[PDB]
Ligand binder design. Structure first.
Ligand SMILES: O=C(O)C1=C[C@@H](OP(=O)(O)O)[C@@H](O)[C@H](O)C1
Length: 168
């Protein structure tokens, strides 16, 4: 089972925090998006575009559930995984770190050329705010630790996480 599971919007720092946490803990990082691509032989973009979000979510839930059983390192979940009830259920009992980010900073961090089916222009900020509004209670419901990634540089967020993982 993972030492920690990271959840949060695109742009919250899952990749960067997950790599730095994994290194600090002496374990590997598993990103469920990557796992999906590996198990399907398909890009995430392709799954959304051809088969649709609903089929993606069932796929994702399967992979997340497997990863929670089988991965012993740091697990990073795709931003929308917590929209699946079965994901939220499977997270019960785990250490779950919610990376919280303002809409302004999250938007800024997602404005590159990564393909993001649910966060494309135009009006990407409106889309980001709508994802944040919808998913915030869901992140909160599953989280065991909540961490602000706003401004705070990554090194310091990781330090804060390790500290909170360790003490009562
Ligand atoms: O927000 C979402 O619903 C999604 C987030 C992505 O994960 P990251 O947060 O790792 O980019 C990926 O699973 C897919 O594009 C759907």
């Amino acid at each position: 089972a993972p030492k920690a599971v990271l959840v949060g919007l695109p742009g919250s720092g899952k990749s960067t925090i997950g790599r730095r946490l994994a290194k600090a803990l002496g374990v590997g990082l598993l990103d469920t998006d990557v796992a999906i691509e590996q198990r399907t032989g398909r890009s995430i973009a392709d799954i959304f575009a051809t088969d649709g979000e609903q089929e993606f979510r069932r796929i994702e839930e399967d992979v997340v559930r497997a990863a929670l059983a089988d991965h012993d390192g740091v697990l990073s979940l795709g931003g929308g995984a917590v929209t699946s009830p079965g994901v939220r259920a499977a997270l019960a009992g785990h250490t779950v770190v919610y990376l919280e980010i303002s809409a302004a900073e999250g938007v800024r961090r997602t404005g590159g050329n990564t393909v993001r089916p649910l966060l494309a222009g135009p009006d990407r900020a409106e889309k980001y705010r709508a994802l944040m509004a919808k998913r915030a209670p869901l992140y909160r419901r599953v989280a065991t630790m909540r961490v602000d990634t706003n401004r705070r540089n990554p090194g310091a967020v990781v330090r804060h996480i390790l500290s909170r993982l360790q003490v009562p």
